[PDB]
Amino acid sequence: QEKLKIGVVGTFAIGCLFPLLSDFKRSYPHIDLHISTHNNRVDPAAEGLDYTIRYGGGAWHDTDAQYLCSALMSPLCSPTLASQIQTPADILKFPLLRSYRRDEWALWMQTVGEAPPSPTHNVMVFDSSVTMLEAAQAGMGVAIAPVRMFTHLLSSERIVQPFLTQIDLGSYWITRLQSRPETPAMREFSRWLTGVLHKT
Amino acid sequence: QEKLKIGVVGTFAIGCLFPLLSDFKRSYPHIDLHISTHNNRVDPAAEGLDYTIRYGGGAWHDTDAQYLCSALMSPLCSPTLASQIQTPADILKFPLLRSYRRDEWALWMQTVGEAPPSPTHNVMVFDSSVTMLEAAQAGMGVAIAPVRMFTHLLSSERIVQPFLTQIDLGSYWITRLQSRPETPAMREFSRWLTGVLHKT
């Protein structure tokens, strides 16, 4: 067995990778895959990772980055909050949930032709979209997050996407520190993942 | 309005604090509470936090720590996996999910009188119990986590606690850097939270 150590942003692990892992096992049973999750703030060298799966723009320095898939974002909320939302302005009846990126709501509103929320609007800030969507399911506020990472919540009707409009503030990438040697197990995992994303 | 900035480990935010926030608002409407979540790895000074709510042993250096509540851990799994688990050894039919603490499973097994899992047992490692329990609901493996932080999953029957035995590897605390000035808003929030935990 060849060891492969990968640190995966939790949102991607839950929303994409984990359901696909048995297919990886089918194709490459000889690889001993060690998966750990992170909240997108991670130091691969410190954790001794081979690969990091992360959300971003693909422009990390001293890093070999390969695009995995898009991460278009849109408002997401409980069916109960959705019942009170007919137009984008209605979102502001409720508190807003966002990531550590300060202008996500300003940018989405701007895109659909609305003014940004008031600087004193109730906002809660999340390190992980997984946690954010738990809060959204509870009706704590309206979230904005990568919709394709939450298909399980949409299909089970625990969350709703009230509007079609989506914005791109980043995608999912797999990255290797340029100083980290690329092994056969790494090449195989990377090929499998980019491949299986294209199929599905 | 007096500003109060608090960074809360996501598991505690979802499992305890968020449901109680309206009670805080009722008691102290004059406080402008800015909540952000983290995965228990956080630098309060860097984030300019007033308080940090975190999981641990209460012995952080140069830190004023106040106990919030216990965090006893026990195995947790989907009803489907639970149907195949009658005794603790049966847990090992499945992959194990754990936090970045390497010996959680060894310690729980030891407590119930079993040998630790094999060093080659399939394990997935999680920065946040919230993410871990999402994986557990999906049947990825058997998790071990603070049971009282997941009452929403137990009550809605998305997760099951097959065994009564629990272990203590830490609790939830609220902490202030000793160099961070304590404001009236902080004292009020701390008093409210320790108070409301005792009531409920």
Curated annotation (Swiss-Prot), chains A, B:
GO cellular component: cytoplasm
Keyword Ribonucleoprotein applies: no
The keyword Protease belongs to this UniProt entry's keyword annotation: no
A Gene Ontology molecular function term of the record: sequence-specific DNA binding
Keywords: Activator, Cytoplasm, DNA-binding, Transcription, Transcription regulation
Broad class of where this protein is predominantly found: cytoplasm
Location in or out of the cell: Cytoplasm
GO BP term, example: DNA-templated transcription
Protein family per UniProt: Belongs to the LysR transcriptional regulatory family.
Role played: Regulates the expression of the beta-lactamase gene. Represses cephalosporinase (AmpC) in the presence of beta-lactams and induces it in the absence of them.
Annotated protein name in UniProt: HTH-type transcriptional activator AmpR
Lineage of the species this protein comes from: Bacteria, Pseudomonadati, Pseudomonadota, Gammaproteobacteria, Enterobacterales
Residues of the full protein shown: 93 to 291 of 291
